[PDB]
Design an enzyme around this catalytic site. Structure first.
Site, mmCIF file in Angstrom:
data_model
loop_
_atom_site.group_PDB
_atom_site.id
_atom_site.type_symbol
_atom_site.label_atom_id
_atom_site.label_comp_id
_atom_site.label_asym_id
_atom_site.label_seq_id
_atom_site.Cartn_x
_atom_site.Cartn_y
_atom_site.Cartn_z
ATOM 1 N N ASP A 145 4.240 -20.782 13.040
ATOM 2 C CA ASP A 145 4.061 -20.735 13.671
ATOM 3 C C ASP A 145 2.783 -21.014 14.994
ATOM 4 N N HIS A 190 8.199 -14.724 3.051
ATOM 5 C CA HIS A 190 7.789 -15.819 3.242
ATOM 6 C C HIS A 190 8.664 -16.430 1.447
ATOM 7 N N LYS A 198 18.239 -3.232 1.573
ATOM 8 C CA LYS A 198 20.035 -3.316 2.089
ATOM 9 C C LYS A 198 19.734 -2.735 3.436
ATOM 10 N N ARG A 205 22.816 10.181 -0.490
ATOM 11 C CA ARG A 205 24.500 11.149 -0.217
ATOM 12 C C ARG A 205 24.873 11.169 0.892
HETATM 13 C C1 LIG Z 1 15.146 13.165 3.253
HETATM 14 C C2 LIG Z 1 14.690 14.614 3.382
HETATM 15 C C3 LIG Z 1 14.934 15.295 5.185
HETATM 16 C C4 LIG Z 1 15.227 15.377 2.874
HETATM 17 O O1 LIG Z 1 16.773 15.069 1.800
HETATM 18 P P1 LIG Z 1 17.779 16.180 1.523
HETATM 19 O O2 LIG Z 1 19.621 15.289 0.934
HETATM 20 O O3 LIG Z 1 18.073 17.133 2.614
HETATM 21 O O4 LIG Z 1 17.060 16.523 0.270
HETATM 22 P P2 LIG Z 1 17.000 16.813 -1.069
HETATM 23 O O5 LIG Z 1 16.054 18.176 -1.551
HETATM 24 O O6 LIG Z 1 18.767 17.707 -1.589
HETATM 25 O O7 LIG Z 1 17.656 15.287 -2.347
HETATM 26 C C5 LIG Z 1 17.465 14.873 -2.636
HETATM 27 C C6 LIG Z 1 16.486 14.556 -4.446
HETATM 28 O O8 LIG Z 1 16.170 13.283 -4.051
HETATM 29 C C7 LIG Z 1 15.251 13.458 -3.764
HETATM 30 N N1 LIG Z 1 14.452 13.053 -2.619
HETATM 31 C C8 LIG Z 1 13.777 13.827 -1.470
HETATM 32 N N2 LIG Z 1 13.360 12.879 -0.440
HETATM 33 C C9 LIG Z 1 12.683 11.777 -0.914
HETATM 34 C C10 LIG Z 1 12.754 10.651 -0.306
HETATM 35 N N3 LIG Z 1 11.724 11.048 0.565
HETATM 36 N N4 LIG Z 1 12.327 9.526 -1.120
HETATM 37 C C11 LIG Z 1 13.211 9.781 -2.916
HETATM 38 N N5 LIG Z 1 13.780 11.046 -3.092
HETATM 39 C C12 LIG Z 1 13.286 12.023 -2.319
HETATM 40 C C13 LIG Z 1 14.627 15.165 -4.056
HETATM 41 O O9 LIG Z 1 13.303 15.043 -4.512
HETATM 42 C C14 LIG Z 1 15.573 15.037 -4.619
HETATM 43 O O10 LIG Z 1 16.009 15.483 -6.121
HETATM 44 P P3 LIG Z 1 17.087 16.218 -7.273
HETATM 45 O O11 LIG Z 1 18.094 15.092 -7.191
HETATM 46 O O12 LIG Z 1 15.848 16.049 -9.231
HETATM 47 O O13 LIG Z 1 17.627 17.201 -6.895
HETATM 48 C C15 LIG Z 1 13.033 14.960 2.848
HETATM 49 O O14 LIG Z 1 13.532 14.409 1.477
HETATM 50 C C16 LIG Z 1 12.808 13.926 3.514
HETATM 51 O O15 LIG Z 1 11.519 12.540 3.478
HETATM 52 N N6 LIG Z 1 12.346 13.789 4.989
HETATM 53 C C17 LIG Z 1 10.641 12.661 6.076
HETATM 54 C C18 LIG Z 1 9.639 13.525 6.216
HETATM 55 C C19 LIG Z 1 8.710 13.053 6.853
HETATM 56 O O16 LIG Z 1 8.039 11.710 6.589
HETATM 57 N N7 LIG Z 1 8.237 13.903 7.939
HETATM 58 C C20 LIG Z 1 7.148 13.241 8.924
HETATM 59 C C21 LIG Z 1 6.893 14.028 10.101
HETATM 60 S S1 LIG Z 1 8.411 13.794 11.420
HETATM 61 C C1 LIG Z 2 10.193 -9.314 -3.499
HETATM 62 C C2 LIG Z 2 11.632 -10.091 -2.275
HETATM 63 C C3 LIG Z 2 10.423 -11.100 -1.839
HETATM 64 C C4 LIG Z 2 12.656 -10.234 -3.317
HETATM 65 O O1 LIG Z 2 12.380 -10.283 -4.470
HETATM 66 P P1 LIG Z 2 13.929 -11.369 -4.912
HETATM 67 O O2 LIG Z 2 13.971 -11.181 -6.280
HETATM 68 O O3 LIG Z 2 13.963 -12.578 -4.605
HETATM 69 O O4 LIG Z 2 14.602 -10.283 -4.229
HETATM 70 P P2 LIG Z 2 16.254 -9.245 -4.757
HETATM 71 O O5 LIG Z 2 17.643 -9.069 -4.054
HETATM 72 O O6 LIG Z 2 16.851 -10.250 -6.371
HETATM 73 O O7 LIG Z 2 15.356 -7.606 -5.853
HETATM 74 C C5 LIG Z 2 16.334 -7.449 -6.730
HETATM 75 C C6 LIG Z 2 16.636 -5.857 -7.188
HETATM 76 O O8 LIG Z 2 15.233 -5.554 -6.873
HETATM 77 C C7 LIG Z 2 14.765 -4.606 -5.827
HETATM 78 N N1 LIG Z 2 14.078 -4.739 -4.459
HETATM 79 C C8 LIG Z 2 13.255 -5.465 -4.172
HETATM 80 N N2 LIG Z 2 12.824 -5.514 -2.926
HETATM 81 C C9 LIG Z 2 11.780 -4.681 -3.695
HETATM 82 C C10 LIG Z 2 10.509 -4.063 -3.790
HETATM 83 N N3 LIG Z 2 9.615 -4.025 -3.230
HETATM 84 N N4 LIG Z 2 10.400 -2.829 -4.577
HETATM 85 C C11 LIG Z 2 10.801 -2.591 -5.245
HETATM 86 N N5 LIG Z 2 12.994 -3.255 -5.808
HETATM 87 C C12 LIG Z 2 12.792 -4.375 -5.357
HETATM 88 C C13 LIG Z 2 16.496 -5.797 -4.773
HETATM 89 O O9 LIG Z 2 16.889 -4.092 -4.169
HETATM 90 C C14 LIG Z 2 17.601 -5.202 -5.752
HETATM 91 O O10 LIG Z 2 18.311 -4.553 -6.591
HETATM 92 P P3 LIG Z 2 19.846 -4.445 -7.643
HETATM 93 O O11 LIG Z 2 18.782 -4.717 -8.174
HETATM 94 O O12 LIG Z 2 20.054 -3.528 -7.417
HETATM 95 O O13 LIG Z 2 20.331 -5.456 -6.973
HETATM 96 C C15 LIG Z 2 11.473 -8.784 -1.333
HETATM 97 O O14 LIG Z 2 11.939 -7.777 -1.802
HETATM 98 C C16 LIG Z 2 10.258 -7.900 -0.325
HETATM 99 O O15 LIG Z 2 10.009 -7.280 -0.590
HETATM 100 N N6 LIG Z 2 8.722 -9.116 -0.161
HETATM 101 C C17 LIG Z 2 7.359 -8.175 0.404
HETATM 102 C C18 LIG Z 2 8.468 -8.395 1.871
HETATM 103 C C19 LIG Z 2 7.266 -7.505 3.095
HETATM 104 O O16 LIG Z 2 6.666 -7.341 2.652
HETATM 105 N N7 LIG Z 2 7.127 -8.813 3.904
HETATM 106 C C20 LIG Z 2 5.615 -7.953 5.175
HETATM 107 C C21 LIG Z 2 5.666 -9.403 6.158
HETATM 108 S S1 LIG Z 2 4.306 -10.898 5.223
HETATM 109 O O1 LIG Z 3 -1.188 -18.022 5.065
HETATM 110 N N1 LIG Z 3 -1.120 -19.228 6.267
HETATM 111 O O2 LIG Z 3 -0.982 -20.076 6.159
HETATM 112 C C1 LIG Z 3 -0.349 -18.440 7.276
HETATM 113 C C2 LIG Z 3 -0.440 -19.048 8.328
HETATM 114 C C3 LIG Z 3 -0.391 -18.105 9.709
HETATM 115 C C4 LIG Z 3 1.326 -16.695 9.681
HETATM 116 O O3 LIG Z 3 1.767 -16.442 10.894
HETATM 117 C C5 LIG Z 3 2.229 -14.835 10.639
HETATM 118 O O4 LIG Z 3 2.048 -13.685 10.325
HETATM 119 C C6 LIG Z 3 2.669 -12.521 9.944
HETATM 120 C C7 LIG Z 3 3.680 -11.740 8.671
HETATM 121 O O5 LIG Z 3 3.334 -12.420 7.691
HETATM 122 C C8 LIG Z 3 3.229 -12.817 11.205
HETATM 123 O O6 LIG Z 3 5.221 -13.055 11.525
HETATM 124 C C9 LIG Z 3 2.513 -13.460 12.766
HETATM 125 O O7 LIG Z 3 3.090 -13.270 14.118
HETATM 126 C C10 LIG Z 3 2.787 -14.970 12.423
HETATM 127 O O8 LIG Z 3 2.012 -15.710 13.388
HETATM 128 C C11 LIG Z 3 1.695 -16.470 7.853
HETATM 129 C C12 LIG Z 3 0.885 -17.206 6.954
#
Ligand SMILES: CC(C)(COP(=O)(O)OP(=O)(O)OC[C@H]1O[C@@H](n2cnc3c(N)ncnc32)[C@H](O)[C@@H]1OP(=O)(O)O)[C@@H](O)C(=O)NCCC(=O)NCCS
Ligand SMILES: CC(C)(COP(=O)(O)OP(=O)(O)OC[C@H]1O[C@@H](n2cnc3c(N)ncnc32)[C@H](O)[C@@H]1OP(=O)(O)O)[C@@H](O)C(=O)NCCC(=O)NCCS
Ligand SMILES: O=[N+]([O-])c1ccc(O[C@@H]2O[C@H](CO)[C@H](O)[C@H](O)[C@H]2O)cc1
Ligand SMILES: CC(C)(COP(=O)(O)OP(=O)(O)OC[C@H]1O[C@@H](n2cnc3c(N)ncnc32)[C@H](O)[C@@H]1OP(=O)(O)O)[C@@H](O)C(=O)NCCC(=O)NCCS
Ligand SMILES: O=[N+]([O-])c1ccc(O[C@@H]2O[C@H](CO)[C@H](O)[C@H](O)[C@H]2O)cc1
Ligand SMILES: O=[N+]([O-])c1ccc(O[C@@H]2O[C@H](CO)[C@H](O)[C@H](O)[C@H]2O)cc1
Lengths: 201, 201, 201
Positions: free
Chosen positions: A16, A114, A165, A182
């Site tokens: 870009d 990327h 996803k 859930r």
């Molecule tokens: C999603 C949320 C609203 C509650 O989910 P819920 O179904 O009502 O809560 P539960 O406690 O029954 O969740 C079930 C399980 O998921 C887990 N869980 C809850 N939040 C999770 C999260 N963010 N990421 C991963 N796992 C999470 C719990 O630890 C729990 O564990 P367990 O199965 O071993 O018992 C709360 O967890 C949350 O993260 N809210 C976001 C709060 C926030 O970012 N606020 C900023 C100000 S607006």
């Molecule tokens: C790492 C990435 C590039 C793709 O990985 P990949 O191997 O090509 O993708 P896949 O879908 O085959 O990944 C395999 C599994 O890992 C999981 N996975 C993907 N990204 C993940 C992450 N960041 N953390 C944890 N798990 C991740 C997928 O959900 C998938 O689940 P499954 O095994 O149940 O099917 C992508 O996931 C990502 O997170 N990119 C970063 C993007 C970003 O931050 N962009 C900002 C602008 S530059």
């Molecule tokens: O490393 N580079 O050469 C490089 C140069 C320009 C790039 O463009 C930048 O990427 C950002 C996300 O990572 C945003 O998409 C931004 O709007 C875009 O201009 C991204 C990589």
């Protein structure tokens, strides 16, 4: 052959540094800067700013600065929108948010990625796939929504989840990577938090 | 006995309210402030500011403000460096970034840790172990790289992973804690994202 | 019937566009802005600023800007408090931090959450549950502490963990969601990092 802005809408790799792309980001980053530096009392100025920096904003929008994005004009928002500190949206392409959406602090949206193989990204090549957020969705803190992801209406995304996803509607999804834990049933209509119920009238 | 700056290089617990360490941070923190408050258009100013705040920067470097660090003089970057909003580098010691590295929004690099036992850290004591990022490395959004970690060449760190151990080269790693999920093969030379292929030239 | 501020303390659902709540948020966002935009050398101004914006601050406190909060006056902090960059605290209700607390960069504390069922939060209804952080607690980078949580004294919260449940004292907790991984023993009194011991004398 195929201009750079066309590869974007086609989901192909691109760069870009041309076709006025750089100029667009500047106008945007400029408006964003005014907004991020505005005083808490400049409520009117802040209000019109958001109306000018985003492509589409519904009524009753409120964004708590700072806010970060690439162009801003690729972000379309619905009504009663609310976002807390540090919302980051990498909108090299379209980002659409429904109605009554709620975004907690430090959330990050990116339609851009990327190629994984360092070969395809030598020149920092990138791809862009729009992100669609339904209505009445609530995103937790520190969430990260990746390219081409869709969040179904009424869903909730826990704090800290990495969404790679689509998330179906009416579910509570969370985790790294995000997963459906859930579906929101009627119990959720009485119990709002842990062991807290809510009486009817 | 053994000065504070020597314990740092020896990987021993230390404090930093002496030997000019405070002063150093003040200079660094000053340039960082000028950079972060700089208007989007001030491109030349920005370009020289980064040359003056980092110990080493290569040609074609770009850092999307705001950026945060402790000194800035312990950070060494290669060529074609690109970092998005809110990069944070706690550099009480060496941080070396290779060539053509890409850093997504809100990433945090930290060579500093605190001893686990509240006894050993009664006065905020800390230890520092250098971070080393290889070439052509792409770090996802919200990643956290801990003390003493080393990311091998051409690797990709998925969004949100907490890297607490060395990542070998040519792999895709992710998770909390970050784990290697696969090696980058030749299919990645053809498929850039999900089901998207890329025709030869 | 039952004023909005009373429901807050009762832990009932509520909305905050009345009873001077918005006004309170303004005074706080005002001091907060002065704080974040203050020059690195404004050491004295910074110090009286943290005394004025938080409900209670103990001696030897230090908050590295920027810092983000909702009111600021519901936050109670002990002695020798240290917070790195971007500490976010959503304090619609009480937040209590004990003595000798260490917070790494980009941590988010929130006592507020929203009812999961889109029906209960039609109007952005919320609920707040006070957070309590023990003494000598070290929170790693990018952690998130959810509503009503309590972290016991001397505990360590690893980088990137989402804390949804109380953490007992004297434990190293980590994970998504945060889980206890082990108790801090006496070996933690000799070994500080990986294979590094500390010669008692
Ligand atoms: C999603 C949320 C609203 C509650 O989910 P819920 O179904 O009502 O809560 P539960 O406690 O029954 O969740 C079930 C399980 O998921 C887990 N869980 C809850 N939040 C999770 C999260 N963010 N990421 C991963 N796992 C999470 C719990 O630890 C729990 O564990 P367990 O199965 O071993 O018992 C709360 O967890 C949350 O993260 N809210 C976001 C709060 C926030 O970012 N606020 C900023 C100000 S607006
Ligand atoms: C790492 C990435 C590039 C793709 O990985 P990949 O191997 O090509 O993708 P896949 O879908 O085959 O990944 C395999 C599994 O890992 C999981 N996975 C993907 N990204 C993940 C992450 N960041 N953390 C944890 N798990 C991740 C997928 O959900 C998938 O689940 P499954 O095994 O149940 O099917 C992508 O996931 C990502 O997170 N990119 C970063 C993007 C970003 O931050 N962009 C900002 C602008 S530059
Ligand atoms: O490393 N580079 O050469 C490089 C140069 C320009 C790039 O463009 C930048 O990427 C950002 C996300 O990572 C945003 O998409 C931004 O709007 C875009 O201009 C991204 C990589
Ligand atoms: C928690 C911490 C202090 C060390 O925990 P510890 O018990 O002394 O270390 P260990 O290596 O024995 O941890 C045990 C396991 O947990 C894993 N682990 C470590 N940190 C983790 C984290 N933050 N999240 C999830 N898992 C983690 C380790 O990889 C290890 O894996 P294994 O069982 O396969 O061998 C360190 O991991 C950490 O994250 N510190 C925060 C640093 C930070 O944010 N600093 C910012 C500047 S103040
Ligand atoms: O809480 N304390 O007493 C205390 C006092 C000073 C501290 O030093 C600070 O730590 C930061 C990381 O958390 C950076 O390493 C920074 O450069 C360093 O001066 C850390 C803790
Ligand atoms: O979307 N709404 O209608 C709506 C309107 C006002 C709201 O209040 C705000 O919520 C924040 C957390 O998300 C903080 O608690 C803040 O102090 C509070 O005023 C929350 C949602």
């Amino acid at each position: 052959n195929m201009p750079m802005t066309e590869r974007i809408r086609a989901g192909k790799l691109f760069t870009d540094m041309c076709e006025g792309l750089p100029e667009k980001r500047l106008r945007g980053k400029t408006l964003m800067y005014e907004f991020n530096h505005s005083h808490p009392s400049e409520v009117e100025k802040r209000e019109s700013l958001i109306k000018e920096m985003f492509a589409t904003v519904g009524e009753n929008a409120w964004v708590e600065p700072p806010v970060y994005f690439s162009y801003g004009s690729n972000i379309h928002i619905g009504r009663n929108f609310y976002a807390n500190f540090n919302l980051t949206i990498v909108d090299d392409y379209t980002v659409t948010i429904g109605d009554n959406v709620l975004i907690a602090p430090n959330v990050t949206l990116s339609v851009t990625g990327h190629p994984v193989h360092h070969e395809l990204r030598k020149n920092g090549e990138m791809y862009s796939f729009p992100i669609t957020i339904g209505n009445n969705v609530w995103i937790g803190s520190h969430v990260v929504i990746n390219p081409g992801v869709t969040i179904g209406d009424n869903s909730v995304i826990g704090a800290g989840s990495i969404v790679t996803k689509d998330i179906p509607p009416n579910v509570v999804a969370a985790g790294v990577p995000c997963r459906v834990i859930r579906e929101i049933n009627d119990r959720d209509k009485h119990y709002y938090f842990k062991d807290y119920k809510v009486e009817s009238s």
